[PDB]
mmCIF file of C-alpha atoms in Angstrom:
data_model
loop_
_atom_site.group_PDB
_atom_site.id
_atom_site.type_symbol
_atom_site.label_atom_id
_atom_site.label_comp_id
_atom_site.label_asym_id
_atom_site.label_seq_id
_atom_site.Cartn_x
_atom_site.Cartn_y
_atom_site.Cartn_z
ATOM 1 C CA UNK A 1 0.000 0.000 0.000
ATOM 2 C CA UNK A 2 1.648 3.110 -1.298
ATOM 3 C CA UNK A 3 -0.245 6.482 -0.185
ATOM 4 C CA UNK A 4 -2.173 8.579 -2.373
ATOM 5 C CA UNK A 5 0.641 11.299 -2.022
ATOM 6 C CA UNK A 6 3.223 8.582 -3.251
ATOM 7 C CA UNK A 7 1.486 7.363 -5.970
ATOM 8 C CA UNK A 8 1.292 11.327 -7.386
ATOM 9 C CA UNK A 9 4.572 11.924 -6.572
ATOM 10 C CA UNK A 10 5.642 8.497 -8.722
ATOM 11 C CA UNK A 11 2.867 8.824 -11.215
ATOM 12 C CA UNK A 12 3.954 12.681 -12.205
ATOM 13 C CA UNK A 13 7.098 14.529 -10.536
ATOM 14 C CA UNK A 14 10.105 14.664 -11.607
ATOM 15 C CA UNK A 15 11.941 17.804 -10.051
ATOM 16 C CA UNK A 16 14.939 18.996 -12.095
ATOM 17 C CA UNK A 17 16.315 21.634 -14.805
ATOM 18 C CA UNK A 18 17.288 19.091 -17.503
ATOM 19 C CA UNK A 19 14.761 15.938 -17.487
ATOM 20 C CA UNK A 20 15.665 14.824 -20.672
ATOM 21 C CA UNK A 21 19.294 15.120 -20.391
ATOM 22 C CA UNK A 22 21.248 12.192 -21.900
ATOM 23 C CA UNK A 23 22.898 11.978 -18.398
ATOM 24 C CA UNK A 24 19.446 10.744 -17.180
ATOM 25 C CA UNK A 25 19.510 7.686 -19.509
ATOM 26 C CA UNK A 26 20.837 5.162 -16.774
ATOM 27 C CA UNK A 27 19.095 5.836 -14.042
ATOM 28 C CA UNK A 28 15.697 5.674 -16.126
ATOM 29 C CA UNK A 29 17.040 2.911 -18.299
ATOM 30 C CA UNK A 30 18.145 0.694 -15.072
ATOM 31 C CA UNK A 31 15.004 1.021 -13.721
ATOM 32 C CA UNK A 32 12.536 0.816 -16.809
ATOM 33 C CA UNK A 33 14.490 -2.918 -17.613
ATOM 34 C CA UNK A 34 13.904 -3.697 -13.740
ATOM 35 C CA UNK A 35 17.707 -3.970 -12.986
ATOM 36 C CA UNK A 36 17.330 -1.916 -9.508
ATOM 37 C CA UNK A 37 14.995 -4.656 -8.603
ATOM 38 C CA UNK A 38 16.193 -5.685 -4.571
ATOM 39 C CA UNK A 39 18.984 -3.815 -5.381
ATOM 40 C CA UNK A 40 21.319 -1.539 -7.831
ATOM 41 C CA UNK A 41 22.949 -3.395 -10.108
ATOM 42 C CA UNK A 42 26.613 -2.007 -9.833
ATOM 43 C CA UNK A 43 27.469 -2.147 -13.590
ATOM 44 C CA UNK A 44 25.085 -2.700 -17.016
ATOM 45 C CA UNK A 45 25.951 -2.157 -20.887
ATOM 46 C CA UNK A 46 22.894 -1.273 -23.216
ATOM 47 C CA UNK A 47 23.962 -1.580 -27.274
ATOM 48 C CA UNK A 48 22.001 0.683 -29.690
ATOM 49 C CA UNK A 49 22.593 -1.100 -32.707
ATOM 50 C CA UNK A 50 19.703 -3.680 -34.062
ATOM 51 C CA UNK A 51 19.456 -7.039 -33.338
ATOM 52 C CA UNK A 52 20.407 -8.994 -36.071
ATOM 53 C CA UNK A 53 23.977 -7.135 -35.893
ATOM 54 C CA UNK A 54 25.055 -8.495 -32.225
ATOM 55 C CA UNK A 55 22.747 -11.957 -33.364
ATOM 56 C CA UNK A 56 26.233 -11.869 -35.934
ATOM 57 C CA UNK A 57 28.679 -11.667 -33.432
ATOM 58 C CA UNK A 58 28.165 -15.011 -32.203
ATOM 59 C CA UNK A 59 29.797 -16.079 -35.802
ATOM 60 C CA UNK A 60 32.646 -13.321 -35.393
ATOM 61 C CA UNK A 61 35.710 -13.687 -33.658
ATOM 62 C CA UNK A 62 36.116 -16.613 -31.077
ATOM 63 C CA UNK A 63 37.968 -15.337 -27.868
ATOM 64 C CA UNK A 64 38.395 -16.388 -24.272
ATOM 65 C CA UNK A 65 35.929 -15.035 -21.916
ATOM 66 C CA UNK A 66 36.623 -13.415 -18.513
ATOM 67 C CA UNK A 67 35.898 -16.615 -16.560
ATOM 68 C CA UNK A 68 38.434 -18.953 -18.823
ATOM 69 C CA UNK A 69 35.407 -20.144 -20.911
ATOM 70 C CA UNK A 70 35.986 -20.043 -24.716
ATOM 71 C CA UNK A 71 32.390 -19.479 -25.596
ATOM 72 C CA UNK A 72 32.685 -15.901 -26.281
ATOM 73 C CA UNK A 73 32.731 -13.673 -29.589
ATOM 74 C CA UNK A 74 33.975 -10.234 -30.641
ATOM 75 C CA UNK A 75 32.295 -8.105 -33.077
ATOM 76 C CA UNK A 76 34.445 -7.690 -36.410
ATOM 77 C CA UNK A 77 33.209 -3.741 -35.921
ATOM 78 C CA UNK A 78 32.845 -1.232 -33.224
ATOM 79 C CA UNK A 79 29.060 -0.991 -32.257
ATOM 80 C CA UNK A 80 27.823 2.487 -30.251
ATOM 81 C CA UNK A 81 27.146 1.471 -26.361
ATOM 82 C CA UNK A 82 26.167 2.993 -23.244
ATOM 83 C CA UNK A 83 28.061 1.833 -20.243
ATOM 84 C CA UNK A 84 25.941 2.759 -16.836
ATOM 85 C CA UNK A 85 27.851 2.613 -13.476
ATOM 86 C CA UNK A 86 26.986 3.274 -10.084
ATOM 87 C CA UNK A 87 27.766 6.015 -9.102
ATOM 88 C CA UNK A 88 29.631 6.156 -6.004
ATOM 89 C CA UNK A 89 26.804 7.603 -3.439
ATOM 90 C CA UNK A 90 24.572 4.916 -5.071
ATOM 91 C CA UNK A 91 22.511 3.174 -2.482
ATOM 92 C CA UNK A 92 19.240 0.844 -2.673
ATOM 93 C CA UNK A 93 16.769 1.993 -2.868
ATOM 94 C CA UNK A 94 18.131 5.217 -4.205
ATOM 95 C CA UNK A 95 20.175 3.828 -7.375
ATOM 96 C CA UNK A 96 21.757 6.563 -9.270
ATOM 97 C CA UNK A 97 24.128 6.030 -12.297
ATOM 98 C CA UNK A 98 26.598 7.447 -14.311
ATOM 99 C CA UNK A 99 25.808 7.183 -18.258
ATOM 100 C CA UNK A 100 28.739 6.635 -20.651
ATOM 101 C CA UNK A 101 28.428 7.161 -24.369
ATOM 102 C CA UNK A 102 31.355 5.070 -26.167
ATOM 103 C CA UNK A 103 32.040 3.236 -29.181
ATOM 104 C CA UNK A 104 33.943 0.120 -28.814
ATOM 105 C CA UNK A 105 33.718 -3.800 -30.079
ATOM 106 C CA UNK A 106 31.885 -6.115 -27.875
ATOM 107 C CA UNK A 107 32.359 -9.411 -26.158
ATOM 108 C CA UNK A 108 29.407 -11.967 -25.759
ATOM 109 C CA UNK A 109 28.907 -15.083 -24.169
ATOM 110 C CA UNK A 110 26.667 -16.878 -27.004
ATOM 111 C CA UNK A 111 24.727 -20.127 -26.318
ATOM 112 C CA UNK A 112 21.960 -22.318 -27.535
ATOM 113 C CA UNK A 113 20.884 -23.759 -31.050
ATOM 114 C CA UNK A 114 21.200 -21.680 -33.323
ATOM 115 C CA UNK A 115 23.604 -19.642 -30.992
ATOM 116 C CA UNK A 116 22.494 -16.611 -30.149
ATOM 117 C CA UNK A 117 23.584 -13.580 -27.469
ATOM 118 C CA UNK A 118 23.238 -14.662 -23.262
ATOM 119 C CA UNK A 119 25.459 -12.517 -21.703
ATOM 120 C CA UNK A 120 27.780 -9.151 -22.046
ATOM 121 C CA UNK A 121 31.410 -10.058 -21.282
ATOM 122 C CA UNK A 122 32.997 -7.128 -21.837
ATOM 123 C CA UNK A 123 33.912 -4.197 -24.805
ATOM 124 C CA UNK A 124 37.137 -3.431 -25.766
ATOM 125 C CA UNK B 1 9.471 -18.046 -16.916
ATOM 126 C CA UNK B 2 12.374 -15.986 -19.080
ATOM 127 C CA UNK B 3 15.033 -17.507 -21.294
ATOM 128 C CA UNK B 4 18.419 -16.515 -21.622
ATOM 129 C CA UNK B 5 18.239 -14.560 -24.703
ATOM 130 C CA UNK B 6 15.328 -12.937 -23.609
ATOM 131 C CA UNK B 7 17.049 -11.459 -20.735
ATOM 132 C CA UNK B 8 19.976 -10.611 -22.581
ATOM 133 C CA UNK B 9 17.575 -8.385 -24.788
ATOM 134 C CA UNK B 10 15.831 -6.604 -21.491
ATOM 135 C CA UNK B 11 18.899 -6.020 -20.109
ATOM 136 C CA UNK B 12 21.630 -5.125 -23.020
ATOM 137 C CA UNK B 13 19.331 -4.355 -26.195
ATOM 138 C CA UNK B 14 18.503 -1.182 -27.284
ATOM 139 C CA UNK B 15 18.484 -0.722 -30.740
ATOM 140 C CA UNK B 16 17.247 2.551 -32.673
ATOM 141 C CA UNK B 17 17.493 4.793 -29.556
ATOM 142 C CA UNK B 18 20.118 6.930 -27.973
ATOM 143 C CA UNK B 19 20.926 8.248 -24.823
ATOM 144 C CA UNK B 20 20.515 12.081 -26.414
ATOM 145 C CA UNK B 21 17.246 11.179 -27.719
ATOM 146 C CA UNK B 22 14.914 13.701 -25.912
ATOM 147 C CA UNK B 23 11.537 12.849 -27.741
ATOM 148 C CA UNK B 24 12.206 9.230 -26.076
ATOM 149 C CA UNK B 25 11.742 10.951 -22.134
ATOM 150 C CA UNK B 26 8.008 9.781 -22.073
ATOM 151 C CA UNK B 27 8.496 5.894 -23.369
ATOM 152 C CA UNK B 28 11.503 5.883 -20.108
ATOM 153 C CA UNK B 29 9.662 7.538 -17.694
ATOM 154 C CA UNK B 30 6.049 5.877 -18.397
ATOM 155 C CA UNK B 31 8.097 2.270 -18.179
ATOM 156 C CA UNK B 32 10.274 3.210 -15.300
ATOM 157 C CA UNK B 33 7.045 4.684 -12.828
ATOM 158 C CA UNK B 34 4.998 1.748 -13.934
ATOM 159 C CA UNK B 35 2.599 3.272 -16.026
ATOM 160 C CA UNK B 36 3.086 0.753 -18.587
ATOM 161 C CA UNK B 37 1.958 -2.385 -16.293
ATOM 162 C CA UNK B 38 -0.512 -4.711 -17.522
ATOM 163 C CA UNK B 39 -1.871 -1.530 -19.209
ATOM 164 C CA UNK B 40 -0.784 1.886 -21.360
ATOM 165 C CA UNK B 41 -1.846 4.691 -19.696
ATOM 166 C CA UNK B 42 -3.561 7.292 -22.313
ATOM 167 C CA UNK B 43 -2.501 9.998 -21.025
ATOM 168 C CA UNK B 44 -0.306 11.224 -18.210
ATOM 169 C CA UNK B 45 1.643 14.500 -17.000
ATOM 170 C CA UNK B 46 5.189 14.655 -15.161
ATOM 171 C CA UNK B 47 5.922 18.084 -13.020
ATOM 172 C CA UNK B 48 9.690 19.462 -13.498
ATOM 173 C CA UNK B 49 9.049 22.066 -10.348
ATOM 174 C CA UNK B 50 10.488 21.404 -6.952
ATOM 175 C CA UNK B 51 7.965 19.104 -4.720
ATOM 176 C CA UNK B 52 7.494 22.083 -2.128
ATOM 177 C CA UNK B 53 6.570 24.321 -4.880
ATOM 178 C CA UNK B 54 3.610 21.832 -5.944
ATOM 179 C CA UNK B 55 2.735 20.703 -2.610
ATOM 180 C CA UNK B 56 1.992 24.842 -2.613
ATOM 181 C CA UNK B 57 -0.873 25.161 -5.000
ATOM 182 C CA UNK B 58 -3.475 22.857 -2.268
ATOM 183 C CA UNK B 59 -3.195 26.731 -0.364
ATOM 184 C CA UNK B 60 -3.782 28.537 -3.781
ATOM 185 C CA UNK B 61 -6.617 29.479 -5.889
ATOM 186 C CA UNK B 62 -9.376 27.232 -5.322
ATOM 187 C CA UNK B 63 -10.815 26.480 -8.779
ATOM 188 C CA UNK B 64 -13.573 23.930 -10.022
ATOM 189 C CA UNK B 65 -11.958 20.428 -11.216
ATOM 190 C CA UNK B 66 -11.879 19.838 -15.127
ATOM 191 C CA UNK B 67 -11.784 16.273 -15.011
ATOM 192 C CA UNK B 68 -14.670 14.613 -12.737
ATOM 193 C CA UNK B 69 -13.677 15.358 -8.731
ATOM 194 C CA UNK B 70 -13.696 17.742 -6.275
ATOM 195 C CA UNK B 71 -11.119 20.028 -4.275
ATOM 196 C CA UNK B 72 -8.732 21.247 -6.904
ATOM 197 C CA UNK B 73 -6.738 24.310 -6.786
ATOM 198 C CA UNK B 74 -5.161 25.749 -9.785
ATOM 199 C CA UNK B 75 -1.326 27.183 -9.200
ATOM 200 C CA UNK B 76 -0.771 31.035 -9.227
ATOM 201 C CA UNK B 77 2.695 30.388 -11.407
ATOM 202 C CA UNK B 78 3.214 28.548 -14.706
ATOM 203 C CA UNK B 79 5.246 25.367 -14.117
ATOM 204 C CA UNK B 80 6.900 23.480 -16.235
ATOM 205 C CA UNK B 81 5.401 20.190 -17.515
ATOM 206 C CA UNK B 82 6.076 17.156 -19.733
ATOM 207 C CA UNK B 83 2.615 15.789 -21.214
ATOM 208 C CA UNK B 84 3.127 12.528 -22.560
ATOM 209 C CA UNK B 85 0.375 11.158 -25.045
ATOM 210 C CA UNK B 86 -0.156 7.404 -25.884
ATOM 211 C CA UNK B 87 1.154 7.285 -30.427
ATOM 212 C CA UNK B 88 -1.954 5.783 -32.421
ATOM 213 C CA UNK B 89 0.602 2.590 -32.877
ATOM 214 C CA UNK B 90 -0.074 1.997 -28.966
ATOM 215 C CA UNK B 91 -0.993 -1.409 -27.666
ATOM 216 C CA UNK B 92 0.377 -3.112 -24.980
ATOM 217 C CA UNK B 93 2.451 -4.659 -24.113
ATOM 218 C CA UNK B 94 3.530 -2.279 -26.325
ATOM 219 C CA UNK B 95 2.997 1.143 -25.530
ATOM 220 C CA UNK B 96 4.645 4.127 -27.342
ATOM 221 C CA UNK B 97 4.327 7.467 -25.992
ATOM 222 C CA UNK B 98 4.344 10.774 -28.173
ATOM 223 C CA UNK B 99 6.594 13.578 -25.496
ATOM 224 C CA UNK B 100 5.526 17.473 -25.477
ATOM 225 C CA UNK B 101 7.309 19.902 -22.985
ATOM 226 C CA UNK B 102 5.317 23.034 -22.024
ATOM 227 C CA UNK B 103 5.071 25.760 -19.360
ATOM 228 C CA UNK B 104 1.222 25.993 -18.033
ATOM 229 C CA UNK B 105 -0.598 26.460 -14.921
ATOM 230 C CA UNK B 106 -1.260 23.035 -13.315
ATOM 231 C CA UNK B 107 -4.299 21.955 -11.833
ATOM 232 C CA UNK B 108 -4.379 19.479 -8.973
ATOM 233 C CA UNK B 109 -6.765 17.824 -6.508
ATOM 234 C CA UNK B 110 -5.743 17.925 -3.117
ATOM 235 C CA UNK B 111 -6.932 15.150 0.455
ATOM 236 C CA UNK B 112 -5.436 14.176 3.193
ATOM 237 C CA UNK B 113 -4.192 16.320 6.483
ATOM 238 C CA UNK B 114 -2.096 18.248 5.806
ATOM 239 C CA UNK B 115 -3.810 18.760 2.595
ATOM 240 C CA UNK B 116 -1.939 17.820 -0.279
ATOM 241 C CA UNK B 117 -2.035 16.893 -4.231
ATOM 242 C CA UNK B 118 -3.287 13.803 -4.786
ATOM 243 C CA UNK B 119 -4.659 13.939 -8.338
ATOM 244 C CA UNK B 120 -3.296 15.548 -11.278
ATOM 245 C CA UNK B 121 -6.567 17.312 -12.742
ATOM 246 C CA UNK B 122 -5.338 19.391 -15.873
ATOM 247 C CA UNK B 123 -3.110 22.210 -17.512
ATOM 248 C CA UNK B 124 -4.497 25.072 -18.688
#
């Protein structure tokens, strides 16, 4: 049971001079993909390019992955990404992030049949 | 339940949007405050003023309601808004929000002791 005053502050305030501000992405991001769920996930990677392009990757290059498995591919190209990271007074329930706009290759874990994208190793 | 590709794309994919994309603040927020739940909601408006300043209008000018209730009280000030408007294409669980930002007198219902806003009402 949320109050009424609660529900109108979540349903429509959001104090602040720049609400659309590209440095907003994470923190709405984050929460929009529930990823502050129990608590703030430290660290996330978002990639803005379409599906079928990282689907690819998984036939790229084969490299090593962080944990010493060898199921993990590098994209042939760079690919635009936005890297979201606590920030350092970041505390559940109050998540806040910092939003990073880079272009680099990525590193997937791919799995399955046909083999597709399961998890974001790293970008490089 | 959800698959492992399926929560690779909710938490890493996506495609066709940017961080700098400002006509995208409506489809984030409307996710993130969970107006997209089980539902779209039409029709919603997000306040950019400080929370004191609205809490402020239930001691302003008392004003008849626009949209079915009682005890609303419009602000003396313009403040600035963010109306966000379901697009046509809209049908969840795909919603898709249309994003217009605007400086207009707000319109609130206020309950509770000490009185404050616990409906949005209208803009005018």
């Amino acid at each position: 049971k949320e109050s009424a005053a609660a529900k109108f502050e979540r349903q429509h305030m959001d104090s602040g001079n720049s609400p659309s501000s590209s440095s907003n992405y994470c923190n709405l991001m984050m929460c929009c993909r529930k990823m502050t769920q129990g608590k703030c996930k430290p660290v996330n990677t978002f990639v803005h390019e379409s599906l079928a392009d990282v689907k690819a990757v998984c036939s790229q290059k084969k490299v090593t992955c962080k944990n010493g498995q060898t199921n993990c591919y590098q994209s042939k190209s760079t690919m635009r990404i936005t890297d979201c990271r606590e920030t350092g007074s970041s505390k559940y329930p109050n998540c806040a992030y910092k939003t990073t706009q880079v272009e680099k290759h990525i590193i997937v874990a791919c799995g399955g049949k046909p083999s597709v994208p399961v998890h974001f190793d790293a970008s490089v």
